[PDB]
Amino acid sequence: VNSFSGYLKLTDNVYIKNADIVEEAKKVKPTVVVNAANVYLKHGGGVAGALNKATNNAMQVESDDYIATNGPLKVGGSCVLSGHNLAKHCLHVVGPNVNKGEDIQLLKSAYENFNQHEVLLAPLLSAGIFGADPIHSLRVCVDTVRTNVYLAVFDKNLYDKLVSSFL
Numbered sequence: 001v002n003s004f005s006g007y008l009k010l011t012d013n014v015y016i017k018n019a020d021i022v023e024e025a026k027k028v029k030p031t032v033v034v035n036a037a038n039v040y041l042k043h044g045g046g047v048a049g050a051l052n053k054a055t056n057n058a059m060q061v062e063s064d065d066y067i068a069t070n071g072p073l074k075v076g077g078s079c080v081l082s083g084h085n086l087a088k089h090c091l092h093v094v095g096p097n098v099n100k101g102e103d104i105q106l107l108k109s110a111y112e113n114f115n116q117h118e119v120l121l122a123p124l125l126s127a128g129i130f131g132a133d134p135i136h137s138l139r140v141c142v143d144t145v146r147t148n149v150y151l152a153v154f155d156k157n158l159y160d161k162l163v164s165s166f167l
């Protein structure tokens, strides 16, 4: 039993809700929140910009030190950093950005990072400003993640379509 509330169950391990991931994290304080990161951990917009803003830019400061030490992530890769005031940890995961021409097959690799954590709060990878089809992203999530994932979808209209079209 966990403290996630109001989710629709899609499969044994995948749950979904129309919610602002920032507000969800602040309420639940999960062990792991997933950020929709880029390889430079530049948290300018989308989910990343919103999460970073909620940390008063502490996420960005920590991220800049991480990059200075380690260099950029790989598309499809991840790193674990602090969750600041939002969660114990933040798993920064880089899905392919279609508006950069990146290979959508890397979306499965991106979701595989979730399997290293027993329970996560997460957005749909490569959705929003990363330009992929969110219906496809949900399909890949369900077919790749085996640990317990709670998906927050900000847009109510998109949430209803993902549910109604879910196979």
Ligand SMILES: OC[C@@H]1COCCN1c1ncnc2[nH]ccc12
Pocket: 019, 020, 021, 022, 046, 047, 050, 122, 123, 124, 127, 128, 129, 134, 151, 152, 153, 154, 155
């Ligand atoms: O689940 C990811 C969805 C779908 O594509 C990107 C937008 N999404 C968000 N969902 C929930 N909270 C959010 N805060 C900022 C963005 C955002």
Ligand SMILES: [Cl-]
Pocket: 045, 046, 047, 127, 128, 129, 130
């Ligand atoms: Cl977005």
